[PDB]
Amino acid sequence: KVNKERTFLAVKPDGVARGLVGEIIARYEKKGFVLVGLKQLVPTKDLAESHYAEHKERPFFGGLVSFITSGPVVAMVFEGKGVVASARLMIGVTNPLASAPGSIRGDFGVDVGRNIIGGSDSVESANREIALWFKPEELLTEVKPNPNLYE
Amino acid sequence: KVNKERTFLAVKPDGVARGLVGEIIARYEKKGFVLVGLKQLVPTKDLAESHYAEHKERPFFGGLVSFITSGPVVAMVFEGKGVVASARLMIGVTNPLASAPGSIRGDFGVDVGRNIIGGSDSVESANREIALWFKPEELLTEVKPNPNLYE
Amino acid sequence: KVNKERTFLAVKPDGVARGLVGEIIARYEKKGFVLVGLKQLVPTKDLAESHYAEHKERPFFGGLVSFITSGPVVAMVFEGKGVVASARLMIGVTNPLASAPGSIRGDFGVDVGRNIIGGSDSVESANREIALWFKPEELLTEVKPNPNLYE
Amino acid sequence: KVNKERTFLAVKPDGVARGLVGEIIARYEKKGFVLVGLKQLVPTKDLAESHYAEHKERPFFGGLVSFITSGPVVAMVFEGKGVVASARLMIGVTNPLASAPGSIRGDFGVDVGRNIIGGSDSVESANREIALWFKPEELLTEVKPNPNLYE
Amino acid sequence: KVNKERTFLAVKPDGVARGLVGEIIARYEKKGFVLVGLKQLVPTKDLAESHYAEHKERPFFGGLVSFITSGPVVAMVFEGKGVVASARLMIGVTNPLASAPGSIRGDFGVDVGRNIIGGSDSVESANREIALWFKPEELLTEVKPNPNLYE
Amino acid sequence: KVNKERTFLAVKPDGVARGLVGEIIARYEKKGFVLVGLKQLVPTKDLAESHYAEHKERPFFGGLVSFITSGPVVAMVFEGKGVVASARLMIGVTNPLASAPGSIRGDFGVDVGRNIIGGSDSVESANREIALWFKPEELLTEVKPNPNLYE
Ligand SMILES: C[C@H](Cn1cnc2c(N)ncnc21)OC[P@](=O)(S)OP(=O)(O)OP(=O)(O)O
Numbered sequence: 001k002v003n004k005e006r007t008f009l010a011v012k013p014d015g016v017a018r019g020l021v022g023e024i025i026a027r028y029e030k031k032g033f034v035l036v037g038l039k040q041l042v043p044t045k046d047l048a049e050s051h052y053a054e055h056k057e058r059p060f061f062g063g064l065v066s067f068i069t070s071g072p073v074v075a076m077v078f079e080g081k082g083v084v085a086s087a088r089l090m091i092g093v094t095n096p097l098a099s100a101p102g103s104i105r106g107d108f109g110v111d112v113g114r115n116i117i118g119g120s121d122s123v124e125s126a127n128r129e130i131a132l133w134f135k136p137e138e139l140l141t142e143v144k145p146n147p148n149l150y151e
Numbered sequence: 152k153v154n155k156e157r158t159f160l161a162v163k164p165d166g167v168a169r170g171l172v173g174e175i176i177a178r179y180e181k182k183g184f185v186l187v188g189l190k191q192l193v194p195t196k197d198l199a200e201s202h203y204a205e206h207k208e209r210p211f212f213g214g215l216v217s218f219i220t221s222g223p224v225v226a227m228v229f230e231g232k233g234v235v236a237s238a239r240l241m242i243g244v245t246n247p248l249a250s251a252p253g254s255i256r257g258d259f260g261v262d263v264g265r266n267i268i269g270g271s272d273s274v275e276s277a278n279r280e281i282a283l284w285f286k287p288e289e290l291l292t293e294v295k296p297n298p299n300l301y302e
Numbered sequence: 303k304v305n306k307e308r309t310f311l312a313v314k315p316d317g318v319a320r321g322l323v324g325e326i327i328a329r330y331e332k333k334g335f336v337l338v339g340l341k342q343l344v345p346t347k348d349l350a351e352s353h354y355a356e357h358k359e360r361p362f363f364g365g366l367v368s369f370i371t372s373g374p375v376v377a378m379v380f381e382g383k384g385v386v387a388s389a390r391l392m393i394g395v396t397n398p399l400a401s402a403p404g405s406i407r408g409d410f411g412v413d414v415g416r417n418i419i420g421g422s423d424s425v426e427s428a429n430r431e432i433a434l435w436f437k438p439e440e441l442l443t444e445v446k447p448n449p450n451l452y453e
Numbered sequence: 454k455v456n457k458e459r460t461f462l463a464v465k466p467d468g469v470a471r472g473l474v475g476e477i478i479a480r481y482e483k484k485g486f487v488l489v490g491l492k493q494l495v496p497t498k499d500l501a502e503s504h505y506a507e508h509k510e511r512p513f514f515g516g517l518v519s520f521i522t523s524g525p526v527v528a529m530v531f532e533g534k535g536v537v538a539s540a541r542l543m544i545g546v547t548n549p550l551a552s553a554p555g556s557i558r559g560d561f562g563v564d565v566g567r568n569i570i571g572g573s574d575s576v577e578s579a580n581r582e583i584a585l586w587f588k589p590e591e592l593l594t595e596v597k598p599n600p601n602l603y604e
Numbered sequence: 605k606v607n608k609e610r611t612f613l614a615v616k617p618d619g620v621a622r623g624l625v626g627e628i629i630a631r632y633e634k635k636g637f638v639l640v641g642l643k644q645l646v647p648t649k650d651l652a653e654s655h656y657a658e659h660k661e662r663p664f665f666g667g668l669v670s671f672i673t674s675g676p677v678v679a680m681v682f683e684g685k686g687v688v689a690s691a692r693l694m695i696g697v698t699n700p701l702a703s704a705p706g707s708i709r710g711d712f713g714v715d716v717g718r719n720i721i722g723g724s725d726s727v728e729s730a731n732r733e734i735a736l737w738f739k740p741e742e743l744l745t746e747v748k749p750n751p752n753l754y755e
Numbered sequence: 756k757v758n759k760e761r762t763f764l765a766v767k768p769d770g771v772a773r774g775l776v777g778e779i780i781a782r783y784e785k786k787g788f789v790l791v792g793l794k795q796l797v798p799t800k801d802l803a804e805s806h807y808a809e810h811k812e813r814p815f816f817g818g819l820v821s822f823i824t825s826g827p828v829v830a831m832v833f834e835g836k837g838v839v840a841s842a843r844l845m846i847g848v849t850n851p852l853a854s855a856p857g858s859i860r861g862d863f864g865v866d867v868g869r870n871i872i873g874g875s876d877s878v879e880s881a882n883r884e885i886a887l888w889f890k891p892e893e894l895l896t897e898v899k900p901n902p903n904l905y906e
Pocket residue numbers: 055060064093094095112113115117118119120121
């Protein structure tokens with residue numbers, strides 16, 4: 001279906017430390033997106049390096065890897081129609097200072113390096129990120145569509 | 152006045168079923184718009200066709216008419232300066248996935264067919280919609296202006 | 303059955319004027335109680351005296367009648383298991399200053415005469431109050447059983 | 454330490470289905486309790502029976518084991534001073550209708566069978582429940598004491 | 605009248621450092637209590653000792669003085685009927701773990717030493733505390749009574 | 756250096772009277788901006804004219820001066836990276852009706868004359884406004900950077 005689209009979201013160590021996990025989950029739940037995977041973990045260097053592989057050649061890659069592996073991360077997978085692009089709109093933009101009020105980064109962030117949450121940029125990136133962070137057993141298979149949310 | 156402008160708003164069956172009525176009323180109350188009419192009802196095919204008349208030649212007309220009659224609707228009328236255009240901005244856009252975080256559809260909707268709330272598109276549409284859903288007795292006549300909201 | 307119990311609730315002129323209608327409705331909706339009746343109206347002296355009949359010989363009767371008729375009131379009917387005793391608990395006690403934080407009066411009221419909301423004191427009072435404020439046509443007959451709320 | 458006390462909390466299938474996971478996590482985070490374990494899973498009949506082992510001879514045991522395995526559950530472990538007793542106070546009482554406004558069950562529940570969340574009744578039950586639902590690797594070891602929350 | 609009663613409230617350094625100032629102020633404003641004095645300051649040892657004078661011979665006195673001077677404090681004065689006792693009820697009890705959900709300490713605190721906010725225990729203590737923290741010029745004199753909050 | 760930027764914000768008499776002080780302070784605190792100055796006062800014509808000096812020859816100058824002196828104002832100073840531009844984004848635009856939902860004016864305002872809060876338009880205007888409303892003693896000097904908010 002088109003309503004079975006999935007995105008990977010990570011509440012970064014700064015979002016976890018600031019106690020924003022519930023606030024964030026509650027925003028995606030109110031939207032109508034279904035939580036199909038959820039876990040708290042301290043990421044390994046390998047998970048971090050494979051996750052941010054598009055920034056591997058840039059000077060700040062080291063710091064990104066160090067910071068995401070510096071403390072607990074809440075990894076989640078949400079399912080819904082256009083969940084990839086929608087989840088991103090809900091987060092805001094790279095710079096939290098330029099992110100609109102009402103968005104996660106707009107409401108809670110001030111620094112690019114401490115930008116609370118990260119989401120998949122595309123359906124291809126999502127499917128790769130989901131497989132990396134989660135095992136098939138850790139993901140829901142039975143997802144009954146809400147007739148209140150979908151026509 | 153100007154500040155006596157009125158708009159018609161309908162919390163659709165999906166918005167009532169999902170328990171979003173108070174959430175929605177609170178947003179317009181916080182804004183400074185005065186509730187001049189309020190009721191819960193199951194709309195008739197008669198009322199629905201008349202309400203959705205601007206789309207009577209479109210292929211989706213029947214579907215809009217079927218859905219708005221499928222369960223209880225919370226019908227309301229708000230009064231304030233630029234309430235028609237403002238109420239619409241507060242709702243978001245046709246596609247809830249494209250609606251900005253901070254708006255009703257932006258925060259709670261995923262599908263065009265399940266887009267929670269509908270509002271008048273113009274002052275002319277509002278005056279027609281208000282007369283169609285409400286009787287003069289069901290509307291407030293005495294509206295004292297709040298000196299904290301109006302200069 | 304027992305989950306089909308109904309209570310009458312009135313957001314008094316002070317609760318309406320202060321813009322607390324959406325806040326209050328959202329509280330009962332969150333709880334799992336179903337809205338089966340809703341309307342805004344300016345009560346007549348006849349409706350006000352009939353409503354406050356149990357206190358018709360008390361010195362404060364006139365004052366209660368004068369205030370409930372002084373502006374718009376939001377009249378509602380909620381359905382659920384033990385809704386009568388549960389709505390009262392959610393409201394708090396007669397004196398809002400003695401009402402616990404978390405209740406409507408505890409969170410928003412300071413005066414007995416400006417105590418925002420009133421609810422039915424018993425199933426008997428509820429059935430009488432509902433018939434007095436609402437016509438059978440104004441009340442839902444089809445109430446969808448929620449399997450997440452009720453075992 | 455005393456501040457290193459841990460409790461096991463489960464958002465039951467009804468709490469997950471109603472989209473209350475984030476609302477719940479936010480409440481414990483706002484309090485100052487640290488999340489040390491988190492996961493979503495559909496529990497097996499075995500894990501449910503071992504979890505509800507204290508009631509294995511009671512007539513309602515079967516019903517509790519059937520319901521907790523009927524859909525996804527969000528399993529969590531929180532750390533803090535008096536977290537076992539405090540989480541329970543935050544949840545409310547067995548009957549959500551008797552639970553005080555401000556508590557989780559007092560704000561969102563109407564039925565004993567659909568009472569959203571369950572928490573450990575003691576430190577001994579917590580240590581057993583934590584070991585039963587989580588592997589030592591799934592739980593945090595490094596827990597930074599907040600000098601704003603602890604003297 | 606008796607609606608002119610005043611209380612002194614202090615958001616302690618832990619309260620301020622955790623970013624609970626606006627949350628706390630919103631609660632008293634929603635209640636109907638009028639803010640008649642407000643300031644942020646780092647208290648001097650002299651002001652701290654004078655404030656905590658009733659406990660000057662207790663073993664914990666030193667610790668209370670050390671902590672209230674360790675960082676910024678948001679000092680405020682609220683006016684309204686029974687504001688002294690009501691403000692205390694809103695705060696909760698000495699131990700935040702024993703404080704009811706819905707109270708400031710019940711919702712946000714875990715430790716007696718980090719109990720976010722302090723309020724006057726009596727009208728006599730309030731009048732003394734107000735004079736100690738505020739100059740007559742720093743306090744409002746013109747307080748128009750809200751007819752929506754007082755009969 | 757860059758994270759030490761400061762802005763001046765004034766919750767205008769309309770914002771104070773509508774009890775919005777707590778809501779506003781919370782928004783800036785959630786964001787990660789540090790409150791370095793805070794006070795409630797009734798501004799003098801001298802302070803008002805100096806504050807609104809950039810518009811001293813515009814026809815609306817008198818109206819702005821009259822209104823900001825008509826009741827209590829909550830003056831505050833926030834510190835953070837890009838706080839001047841970010842605080843304006845959080846306020847919205849001049850016309851609250853055109854302000855996006857999620858912004859303060861977008862969420863609570865209807866009139867240009869009653870637009871709840873004013874903020875510095877530039878770093879130069881901020882430094883001037885801060886020195887005008889606050890004495891150096893009234894401002895924090897020791898501001899430890901939060902490692903959860905800054906890289
Ligand atoms: C490129 C970004 C931001 N970033 C971190 N440090 C720096 C830095 N020093 N210079 C520039 N950019 C930086 O890193 C990943 P993230 O924060 S998950 O995501 P996003 O939502 O921004 O998005 P996408 O476009 O990666 O999906």
